[PDB]
Design a protein around this ligand. Sequence first.
Ligand SMILES: CCCCCCCC(=O)OC[C@H](COP(=O)(O)O[C@@H]1[C@H](O)[C@H](O)[C@@H](OP(=O)(O)O)[C@H](OP(=O)(O)O)[C@H]1O)OC(=O)CCCCCCC
Ligand SMILES: CCCCCCCC(=O)OC[C@H](COP(=O)(O)O[C@@H]1[C@H](O)[C@H](O)[C@@H](OP(=O)(O)O)[C@H](OP(=O)(O)O)[C@H]1O)OC(=O)CCCCCCC
Ligand SMILES: CCCCCCCCCCCC(=O)OC[C@H](COP(=O)(O)OCC[N+](C)(C)C)OC(=O)CCCCCCCCCCC
Lengths: 182, 340, 40
Amino acid sequence: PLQKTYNYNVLMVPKPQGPLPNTALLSLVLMAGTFFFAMMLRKFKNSSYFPGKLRRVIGDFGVPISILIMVLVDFFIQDTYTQKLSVPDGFKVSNSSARGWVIHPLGLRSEFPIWMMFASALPALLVFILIFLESQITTLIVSKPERKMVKGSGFHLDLLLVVGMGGVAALFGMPWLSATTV
Amino acid sequence: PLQKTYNYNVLMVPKPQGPLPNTALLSLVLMAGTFFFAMMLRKFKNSSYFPGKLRRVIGDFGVPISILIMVLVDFFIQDTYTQKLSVPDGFKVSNSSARGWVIHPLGLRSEFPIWMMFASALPALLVFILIFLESQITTLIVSKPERKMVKGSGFHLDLLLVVGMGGVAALFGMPWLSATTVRSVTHANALTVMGKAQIQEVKEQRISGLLVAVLVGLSILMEPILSRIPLAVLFGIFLYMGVTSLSGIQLFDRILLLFKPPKYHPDVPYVKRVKTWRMHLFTGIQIICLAVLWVVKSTPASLALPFVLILTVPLRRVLLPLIFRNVELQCLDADDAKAT
Amino acid sequence: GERVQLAHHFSEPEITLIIFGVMAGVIGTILLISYGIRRL
Ligand SMILES: CCCCCCCC(=O)OC[C@H](COP(=O)(O)O[C@@H]1[C@H](O)[C@H](O)[C@@H](OP(=O)(O)O)[C@H](OP(=O)(O)O)[C@H]1O)OC(=O)CCCCCCC
Ligand SMILES: CCCCCCCC(=O)OC[C@H](COP(=O)(O)O[C@@H]1[C@H](O)[C@H](O)[C@@H](OP(=O)(O)O)[C@H](OP(=O)(O)O)[C@H]1O)OC(=O)CCCCCCC
Ligand SMILES: CCCCCCCCCCCC(=O)OC[C@H](COP(=O)(O)OCC[N+](C)(C)C)OC(=O)CCCCCCCCCCC
């Protein structure tokens, strides 16, 4: 938050343990600037300025150009803290003490009960309903006739693929996915 | 500056004696916000949303609405410091020990020499050229035929009034003023009624400027109101006026046409009756003149700017016909935007 | 005025009146000169 005074000695690892000056305002400035540049380049793509092909190219790379611009802006402002992308160190499980890469269907530390083996069908039905509705409505949205899609779309192959890879990835202790609308 | 650590116990009188957190970033946010709101309300005026009359009203008050919104935004952030408007404490001379309200022409503390009584003409000459050029060029710009002013403009009465009032105010230890370009253009634009893209009429009246002058005089007694108005909101307002004052300038339009392909070029006489490269040569000569004037303004010899600006009249009247045909000059340099 | 000021023979109204009178005189002189020319 914006305060008159801050603590100039604040622990930085893993995340700041207290408020920091200029953080929220610079975050707002970077967000607003990124959105502004993205929209200005989107307008410039449809505009009538410069060679049209260059404008189409420049406007095609509008989002990467805005990202690069504001990333450079944050790069040159080194005194102010901004939260960055945090990616895991390596290709290892998040908990090396709780599970491995492969999950035993009969249990890791306790024997899996038989009743829940048949009682997993209801959560599976709920997950199937969620994934089905999300993926198929997304496919409907992207394959509308007004979107000028000529190559066709798959409502049976895509659902089979998505839910099958989800079921297979469940065995490896990994999330099942779905076709995300946005 | 933005720095990792700040001193928290800094003295706050009469102004920051050191760096403060969140100040520059909040100034940037306030300026961008008020500029964005002003431009959004300007587009709302010309938009097709809401009852049109309400949209026209809301759009007319667009700058006051933006100012109020950002003033409230800074009001509700109490911990952060932003520089506010400061007015004098009262209607007193700015330095009590140096002079009074009235200045004796023969001297205050020492006798004024005789030779300077005659030698004051040359600085008076320079001031007269400055004020004359600024005021008459502002009158020319504001009272253009394309601006739809039917009430007439007087080039002799206004110059006499401005210079005589300045000369009288000099006797009272007060500055001589001039008809500024940006403020007058903004004032005329704020009174312009748009048609259904095309100028329809301007509300030419004496009450708006009179009320502005009265409020400027009363600003000393409006300290509790002005002390809560940040300078960043006014900076965004200034940016709005600067980008707005370029609407009716054909030089700006042709500079845009430099970045704009010819097929796109609009249906205007200096495009349809002049070759594109000739038009761009015209624009480039004007750009060279602008660069020369900017350079002159950057030197300490910036008071010679009126004379260098005057030199652009022999340019257009002599050197331009030596490289441009009369048709091209009529199309490009048109008094009332006519196709010769 | 303010503080300690030199006392001249003429006050401020007197000196400004004499300066306005001199200015009116020279203005009338130039006007009469211009009226004399462009006629003869
Ligand atoms: C930047 C490159 C040009 C620099 C100098 C400019 C002079 C220069 O190098 O000539 C090339 C060209 C001139 O325009 P020119 O009419 O030759 O070319 C048209 C121009 O490329 C349009 O943008 C195209 O529109 P779009 O494809 O339909 O969308 C149009 O395609 P189409 O209608 O035929 O299909 C083209 O025909 O440049 C500009 O675009 C002018 C402003 C450029 C910006 C100047 C500011 C640096
Ligand atoms: C702020 C109002 C709150 C909504 C209250 C809900 C009530 C409400 O406002 O809607 C009904 C009413 C319909 O009345 P009506 O159609 O007669 O009113 C038209 C409207 O004023 C247009 O803006 C005018 O065009 P312009 O711009 O002057 O050129 C047009 O005149 P003209 O030029 O065509 O001859 C007017 O005829 O308004 C709307 O137009 C719909 C916009 C809804 C406004 C919704 C905005 C959020
Ligand atoms: C594309 C551009 C989009 C613009 C959107 C702006 C969103 C603003 C987000 C702040 C809102 C908020 O909630 O601020 C509230 C904050 C923090 O909350 P707190 O309760 O103090 O935190 C305490 C929580 N603990 C318990 C975790 C510690 O207070 C402040 O320090 C006030 C700062 C507000 C500044 C507003 C910035 C300018 C806004 C207008 C710009 C035109």
